């Protein structure tokens with residue numbers, strides 16, 4: 001079913017994550033963490049305080065797909081055991097030093113061809129696949145985008161609901 005998923009997405013905020021490589025999304029799925037540039041770090045920390053759920057929706061650049069979506073379970077935190085991110089050019093380890101814990105809600109992919117009917121009012125009504133890393137996605141668009149993903153039957157949202 002989809003009722004707990006809908007409950008998690010109730011009045012959530014949604015942010016588009018654009019990764020320059022597959023390796024870091026695979027690491028994020030394995031280790032339950034994400035890091036972003038300081039300008040986005042600040043926005044996510046603020047939104048983590050503001051809403052029942054903050055949802056990250058991941059797309060690897062040039063893949064033509066989303067790779068899944070996850071819910072922030074913490075604010076960012078610096079200085080722990082370093083995450084072995086593959087660093088994009090011009091991106092240093094210090095720039096990505098803030099670590100967010102995340103709980104994955106869906107690790108299945110969705111091709112851009114299936115979201116062509118969803119546009120994001122916070123990005124000039126462009127198709128929701130279009131956007132820079134950290135672009136916020138409006139509530140209705142974000143909800144519908146998440147509901148388009150194939151079910152991930154490996155996930156139990158019972159614990160995530162307890163964190164809300």
Ligand SMILES: CNc1ncnc2c1ncn2C
Pocket residue numbers: 018019020021024034035036037085088096133
């Ligand atoms: C682990 N964070 C990241 N990895 C790869 N690329 C990124 C990232 N953040 C923003 N961009 C463009």
